[PDB]
Each structure stands twice: as C-alpha cells, then as structure tokens.
Write a protein that binds this ligand. Structure first.
Ligand code: QCZ
Length: 112
C-alpha cells in the first residue's frame, strides 16, 4: 500500500476502482489485455506501453510509485491505450469513460 499521505489517497482510489461498486464497467481493466485470446493481433503494434489495474496494484504494493503523479500517469495510460486502440463506439470505450470519471473526480479530491 501507499506510505505518503497522497499515495494513501491513490491507494484508496485504486481500491474503489477494483470494488464491486464499479465492477459492471471496471472489469475490462482488471488484468492485462490478452491480445492473443481476444484476437487483437495488432494490439502490441499500436499499444507500446500496456497498463491495467492489476499492474497498478502490483506497483503500489511494491512501493514502485514515488508520488501521486506517477500513479495517476499509469491509470491515465490505461485509459489512453483504450481510447487509442478501440473504435470510440465500442462498449469498452463507454466503460473506460465511466471508470475514468470515477478516477478523475476522486483524484481531484487529493489532500494538499
Ligand atoms: C482494455 N480492454 C480492451 O481494450 C478490450 C478490447 C476489446 C476489443 O475487442 N477491441 C476491438 C477493437 C474493437 C475487447 N475487450 C473485451 C470486452 C470489453 C468490453 C465489452 C466486451 C468485450 C477489451 O477489454
């Protein structure tokens, strides 16, 4: 988990993004995109830096993130990858937009 006050807020957000409350739209972001399994044979040609919430959780648990900004960059990279790869009318993009709304509104409540 987070040690710094701001990293504890980040860890709180991460726990919320992984909670049953948001599972209906969070689930595509729980684990790395399995490009082979999903038939997305161009995924790793288009997405140079895959990211997902299990990777963010591992990095938080390993004290990889030194500040809130570094944590937020990985969460936003995950959404950006979704918006880059997927047609904007795909269900996964609607789910990304909803989960990013949850993220951005709570990230904005960061303690100073
Ligand atoms: C981060 N996830 C992805 O980018 C992703 C891409 C595609 C996908 O098939 N994308 C192609 C480009 C349309 C499929 N799923 C599963 C899914 C998700 C939501 C509804 C149905 C299926 C994903 O999670």
């Amino acid at each position: 988990g987070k040690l710094s006050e701001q990293l504890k807020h980040c860890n709180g957000i991460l726990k919320e993004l992984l909670s049953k409350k948001h599972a209906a739209y969070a689930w595509p972001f729980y684990k790395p995109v399995d490009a082979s399994a999903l038939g997305l044979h161009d995924y790793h040609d288009i997405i140079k830096h895959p990211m997902d919430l299990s990777t963010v959780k591992r990095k938080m648990e390993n004290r990889d993130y030194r500040d809130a900004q570094e944590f937020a960059a990985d969460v936003r990279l995950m959404f950006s990858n979704c918006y880059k790869y997927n047609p904007p009318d795909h269900d996964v993009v609607a789910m990304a937009r909803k989960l990013q709304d949850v993220f951005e509104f709570r990230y904005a409540k960061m303690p100073d």
